[PDB]
């Protein structure tokens, strides 16, 4: 045969449980719910008007089976769909009641009777509330090329549920922005080569591939053919460490799997990389970032806002094993906050007015982005080697470095100690926000947030949790709204931060 | 052409022979000495030799059985008779292979299995038109290799380069560049105390639905190829002509290509002009080689004195100038210190740079003559005590970027930090470089921190594993383009080895003589202008 569908589906207007079905809304008043989508249009056009030279025998053009439902909706300029063999499932009207150089049908089976008689490459099913429906009910559809507009609109029609048992995903594209929404494209479904083998003559065998994880558990992960969604930069590092990672016991007498040296790149112009295979929260961490800009080392400011990210490191007992016997509870010492605004100054306590003592890097980096964008000395370093001893712990995040090309701002953050299961997910969120923040106050469009992992580890009792995680297919990323009016780094407040269209899988306890 | 039909291939291993130096592929030719191998065993050369000559793919047979007609599956090894008698007997005949011997002085009627016996080339064709075999490998020795190539009967060659020198009496014959081009070069390994690599030469011309989707998911790609920077990739014939570029130098070369083809056009401070990208990782296995670029000449005396200088804690430019190392000469002149607003700084007093920070971070810099005794943090001593006593720590860092001192320094550090990592008494090292001159600087910086990782690894009684290099601002200078183009069409030679003098057990106690770069084989020096 060679029959395929191809839909575009947004989310429907009326705690929320998201699932594949979330994305159903197909039409609103005989048109799309969204007024236009350039990138979706282009994808659909490239898909439906591509033909491979060879692959026939086993010009040459594709079929596009729409219905009266759909056909009529299309303007006259595009019609009859450029470079395609159009077809129209209408009971109502015959070839006598239409203009263009089309073919008609009436029954579902009268497509079989037309197709067995025709020259083509591939057969695409373009649209119809019911034109998808009865095609699934009559197991006729091989793959579904399915676009997810990751925003919410009013609709009157849907796309029918999809049987987990009948159809499964085998490809997830890169995530894009276009027409002020994110979207991605997925696929549902029912002599110099032996040279490769010779060059692999020295790798692991079959039971030497270090670690006692299982294939059987990663059924759905190992299945996916193209893993181009950028959440897979995180997921494949979980998969690299799990399978190839060195077993170490640490300081505490616990147990991790560790590798050394990874780099993730996230394009903030196209999405906000808030991992989608588990629920994440950003109030906790946006408030940590504001606390940093304000220059605080005061455990209490965060505790009183029920941000407990540092509670553990402020206790009488934790400071005392650092040898900080002269340190008030929740006085974390010269940490992120102090080093950013007062680097070099002598630290006294967390209450002291430090104004105009030390190096205000944050101001410096910002003036350098504005004054000298082509500089290669735009670093923000929290690892003061004089003050490490004095900190409740040394910075986990060593440095941000900045790059400006064509009014556009990228950011590498180098991390010395990466807990892949809990921390990294938040860490990717934090320095992403900061990059938007610095971009806005510097009149620049965010480009890539770039994350270098040093000691990258997965804790032994996060593993069953992460297996569950690897086997969940990423949803399209959300977007981050910064209040456009804010234009100094100190003038930001929690309410200037909005996450739009966060579609996500169920919460997971990395634990127990 | 006869050999395409019967898939007849050559496989060989060649060392460098007993006699500045010129180096071509004709450097590697040494085949055998006194009817044995010039090296004792290799082992990995053996394992590679075993895997290839015994590798069979039973699906891809039928296409080749069809092809041969028109003109437990096993390969055929073809062998001169003295190469046969070099084989140690407990290994005769070569297991899981059809052994063919080539002799005039011996026949069928005096072996004991051991083989098929033939007495002529066009006599092997007889057998291959008759036999059930996958591919046919010609394993030598010299007299065989020779008569097989001058007959245009070899379709490719699986040439191992044994990057050491041994006594030789039989050689592989000069390959002609016109008849054979290298399509593929492999990872470098260390085996029985030599670097070695694997290269393929090729005879020149002088569910399959997982296929469309790629094209689809590729819809929004920028390049149909209105080439994004004015580089004509038809100037990189050889670079693009290689199928498998697995040599670890291709990690440096590949970045030059990524920057050349994809860089952002920027101009700097002085106006000089660059193409830039942000953020690369290179990893090198120091256990398997020493990553000193082979696509041009590099001297290490300068960068080694510098590293010893840093460890001594010095900041005196004179000390290096008095050893004819001019690295920091430009950064210490009245002129340069003056534009830095360091008018109260003596010429060649460069200030609180690498040496100072490693030995005395957070001390107040006075001058290059102040001995700063027990003043500021001795980081280097700290990282050496952390690796010995605290290897599981994720806090074993050394940082040269002291925000407080940046303006007092002749220039800010390019090598922000090193972080060490210790699994199973092996020591990996990561270095973050804020700014990266790919054409001039990064080559030395690769060798510089690889050299340091070895030094730590020795004084902490550990073996060196990975040198990991993180690039941030990665830029090729517009003047380095032509030269880097030339360099990209040179095929890397196997990396040399670095031997430190093993009596050194203190980081303080290394001296220029305690450092030996053995078997540096390389293309000729390129001026980047
Ligand atoms: N580096 C590497 O990869 C390899 C190294 N070697 C080394 O090479 C050396 C052996 O090579 P070399 O000295 O050239 O000897 P060969 O292995 O090439 O054998 C030569 C002998 O093979 C027979 N022979 C060769 N060609 C023909 C022909 N066309 N027709 C009939 N008989 C033929 C003759 O045997 P007869 O005397 O009975 O007439 C001849 O004397 C050793 O030192 C060995 O270790 C060997 C192979 C691979
Ligand atoms: C009729 C049929 C199909 C379409 C339209 C009308 C409008 O845009 C699409 C093509 C692009 N994907 C979305 C749907
Ligand atoms: C006969 C034929 C070939 C060989 C030998 C004997 C000894 O080992 C080699 C194969 C591996 N490279 C070295 C040469």
Which DSSP string corresponds to A36-57?
Answer: --HHHHHHHHHHHT---SGGG-
Unique residue bearing structure tokens 């380069």: B161
> In whole angstroms, what is the distance from residue B511 CA to residue B123 CA?
63
CB contact (8 A) between residue A246 and residue B416? no
Contacts with A155 (C-beta within 8 Å, 6 or more apart), sequence order? A10, A12, A13, A24, A25, A26, A27, A28, A33
Q: Which residues of A touch B52 (CB under 8 A)?
A: 198, 201
Per-residue tokens: A188: 């549902």
Q: Rounded to whole angstroms, how far apart are CA atoms B423 and A341?
A: 37
The CA-based dihedral angle spanning residues A198, A201, A205, A208, taken in that order and rounded to the nearest 10 degrees: -150
Give the pair of three-digit tokens for residue A307: 């941000």
For B279, phi and psi rounded to 5 degrees?
100, 100
Q: Can you tell me which residue has the tokens 């999405």?
A: A271
d(Cα A148, Cα A6) in Å, to the nearest integer? 11
Query: How far, in Å, are A93, A122, A128, B497 from residue A105 at the CA level?
Result: 10, 18, 14, 74
Cα dist. A84→A16, A64, A146 in Å? 41, 6, 20
Q: Is-contact A359 A368, C-beta < 8 A?
A: no
Return the CATH number at A34.
3.40.430.10
Q: Are A83 and A49 in contact, with CB atoms under 8 Å apart? A: yes
Q: Is the CB of B139 under 6 A from ligand 3?
A: yes
Q: Mutual orientation of helices A232-244 and A423-441 as an angle, nearest 10°?
A: 150
Cα–Cα distance measured from residue B145 to residue A88, given in angstroms and rounded to the nearest whole number: 69
Ligand 1 atom nearest to B105, measured from its CA: 38
Residue bearing the CA closest to ligand 3, atom 13 = B13
CA gap A456, B191 in Å, rounded:
30
> B441 touching A, CB under 8 A?
no
Asked if B491 and B246 touch (Cβ cutoff 8 Å), the reply is no
Q: Which residue, among B402, B322, B391, B407, has the nearest Cα to B355 in the 3D structure? A: B402
**Distances, alpha carbon B214 to alpha carbons A142, A167, A388, A473, B209, in Å:** 17, 20, 49, 19, 10
**What is the span of the domain harbouring residue B187?**
8-203
CA distance A169 to A226: 10
Going by C-alpha positions, the residue among A186, A171, A187, A261 that lies closest to residue A225 is A171
- Which of B13, B248, B378, B403 would you mutate first to test chain A, the one with the most A CBs within 10 A? B403
B308 lines ligand 1 (CB under 6 A): no
CA of B115 to the centre of ligand 1 (A): 15
Phi-psi region of B215 (alpha: psi -120 to 50; beta: other; left: phi over 0): alpha
- Written in H, E and C, the secondary structure of A295-350 is CCCEHHHHHCCCCCCCHHHCCHHHHHHCCCCCCCCCECCCCHHHHHHHECCCCCCC
> Which atom of ligand 1 sits closest to the CA of residue B121?
29
Residue A140's φ and ψ, nearest 5 degrees, are -125, -15
CA atoms within 13 A on the CB side of B168: 21
DSSP B130-159: TS--S-EEE---HHHHHHHHTTT--SEEEE
CB B152 within 8 A of CB B5: no
Burial of A262 from C-beta contacts in 10 A (0-12 / 13-18 / 19+)? buried
Q: Cα separation of A366 and B508, whole Å?
A: 40
Return binding residues of B for dUMP: 269, 394-395, 433-435, 437, 445, 475, 477
Residues after which chain B is broken (C–N above 2.5 A) are 19, 71, 206
* Cα torsion through A196, A198, A200, A205, rounded to 10: 130
Coil/strand/helix, residue B394: coil
**How far, in Å, CA of B79 to CA of B138, rounded?**
7
Return all residues near B132 (Cβ < 8 A) that are at least 6 apart. B73, B74
CA atoms of B181 and A301, how far apart (whole Å): 68
User: Which residues are CB-contacts of A199 (< 8 A; sequence separation ≥ 6)?
Assistant: B184, B186, B187, B198, B244, B246
Provide the sign of the torsion angle of the four alpha carbons B79, B84, B88, B92, taken in this order. Answer: positive
For residue B113, the number of C-alpha atoms closer than 13 Å in the C-beta half-sphere is 10
Phi/psi of residue A118, each to 5°? -120, 155
Closest CA to B12 of B198, B260, B216: B198
Give the integer Cα–Cα distance in Å for A268 and A482: 13
Breaks in chain A after (C-N > 2.5 angstroms): 14, 58, 190
**Residue environment code for A277-312, b if the CB has 16+ CB neighbours within 10 A, otherwise e:** bbebebebbbbbbbbbbebbbbbebbbeeebeebee
The tokens of B74 are what?
A: 């096993």
Spacing of C-alpha A463 from chain mean position: 21
CA distances in angstroms from B353 to B319, B338, B361, B362, listed in the order given: 15, 17, 10, 12
Q: For residues B108 and B273, what is the distance between their CA atoms, to the nearest angstrom?
A: 73
Q: Which residues pair with A380 in a beta bridge?
A: A400
Contact criterion met (CB below 8 Å) for B404 and B389: no
Residue B107 is encoded by which pair of tokens?
């026949």
Rounded-to-integer distance, Cα A127 and Cα A298, Å: 59
Look at residues B321, B284, B291, B287 and name the one whose alpha carbon lies nearest to residue B306: B321
Residues A303, A307, A309, CA angle at the centre, nearest 5°? 100
Q: Tell me if A444 sits within 8 A of A409, measured CB to CB.
A: yes
- Strands A123-125, B28-32: pairing is unpaired
> In terms of DSSP bridges, do strands B156-166 and B274-285 run parallel, antiparallel, or are they unpaired?
unpaired
For the stretch A196-199, contacts whose Cβ atoms lie closer than 8 Å and that sit 24 or more positions apart, written own/partner, are A196/B244, A197/B51, A197/B55, A197/B57, A198/B48, A198/B51, A198/B52, A198/B55, A198/B158, A198/B198, A199/B184, A199/B186, A199/B187, A199/B198, A199/B244, A199/B246
Rounded Cα distance between A78 and A126, Å, is 14
Q: Is A51 on the interface with B (CB under 8 A)?
A: no
Question: Could you give phi then psi for residue A48, rounded to 5 degrees?
Answer: -80, -10
Burial level of A79, CB count in 10 A (0-12/13-18/19+)?
Answer: middle
Short-list B48, B40, B304, B87, CA closest to B200: B48
Give me B355's structure tokens. 């040496």
CB contact under 8 A, B403 and A414: no
HEC string for B38-84? CCCCCCHHHHHHHHHHHCCCCHHHHHHHHHHHHCCCCCEEEEEHHHH
Nearest CA among B294, B289, B291 for reference residue B497: B289
| Contact residues, chain A, for B412 at CB < 8 Å | 377
- The catalytic residue positions of B are 414
Beta bridge pairs of residue A265: A450
User: Counting atoms of ligand 3 from 1, which one is nearest the CA of B79?
Assistant: 2
């Amino acid at each position: 045969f060679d029959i395929y569908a191809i839909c575009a589906c947004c989310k429907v207007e009326s705690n929320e449980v998201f699932n594949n079905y979330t994305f159903r809304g197909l039409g609103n008043k005989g048109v799309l719910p969204w007024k236009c989508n350039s990138l979706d249009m282009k994808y659909f056009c490239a898909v439906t008007t591509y033909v491979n030279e060879s692959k026939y025998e086993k010009k040459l053009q594709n079929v596009v089976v729409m219905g009266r439902t759909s056909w009529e909706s299309i303007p006259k300029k595009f019609k009859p769909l450029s470079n395609r063999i159009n077809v129209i499932l209408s009971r109502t009207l015959k070839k006598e009641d239409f203009d263009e150089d089309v073919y008609i049908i009436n029954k579902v089976e009268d497509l079989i009777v037309l197709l067995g008689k025709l020259n083509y490459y591939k057969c695409f099913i373009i649209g119809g509330s019911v034109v998808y429906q009865e095609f699934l009910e009559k197991k006729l559809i091989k793959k579904i090329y399915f676009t997810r507009i990751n925003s919410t609109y009013e609709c009157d029609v849907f796309f029918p549920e999809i049987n987990e048992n009948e159809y499964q995903i085998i490809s997830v594209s890169d995530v894009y922005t276009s027409n002020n929404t994110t979207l991605d494209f997925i696929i549902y479904k029912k002599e110099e080569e032996d040279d490769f083998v010779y060059f692999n003559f020295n790798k692991e065998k079959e039971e030497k591939n270090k670690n006692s994880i299982h294939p059987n558990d990663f059924q759905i992960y190992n299945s996916l053919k193209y893993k181009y969604h950028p959440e897979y930069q995180y997921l494949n590092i979980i998969y690299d460490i799990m399978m190839n990672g060195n077993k170490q016991s640490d300081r505490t007498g616990v147990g991790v799997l560790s590798k050394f040296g990874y780099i993730m790149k996230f394009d903030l112009s196209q999405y906000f990389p808030l991992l989608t295979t588990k629920k994440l929260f950003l109030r906790g961490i946006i408030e940590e970032l504001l606390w940093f800009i304000r220059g605080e080392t005061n455990g209490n400011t965060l505790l009183n806002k029920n941000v407990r990210i540092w509670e553990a490191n402020g206790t009488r007992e934790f400071l005392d094993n650092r040898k900080l016997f002269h340190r008030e509870v929740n006085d974390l010492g010269p940490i992120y906050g102090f080093q950013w605004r007062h680097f070099g100054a002598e630290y006294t306590n967390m209450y002291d007015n430090y104004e105009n003592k030390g190096v205000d890097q944050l101001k410096n980096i910002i003036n350098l982005i504005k004054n000298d964008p082509t500089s290669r000395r735009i670093l923000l370093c929290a690892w003061n080697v004089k003050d490490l001893d004095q900190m409740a712990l040394p910075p986990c995040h060593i440095l941000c470095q900045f790059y400006v090309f064509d009014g556009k701002l990228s950011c590498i953050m180098y991390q010395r100690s990466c807990d892949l299961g809990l921390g990294v997910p938040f860490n990717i969120a934090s320095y992403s926000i900061f990059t938007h923040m610095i971009a806005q106050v510097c009149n620049l469009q965010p480009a890539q947030f770039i994350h270098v992992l040093g000691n990258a580890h997965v804790y032994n009792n996060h593993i069953d949790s992460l297996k569950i995680q690897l086997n969940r297919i990423p949803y399209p990323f959300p977007t981050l709204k910064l209040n456009p009016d804010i234009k100094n780094i100190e003038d930001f407040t929690i309410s200037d931060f909005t996450i739009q269209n966060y579609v996500h899988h169920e919460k997971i306890s990395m634990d127990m």
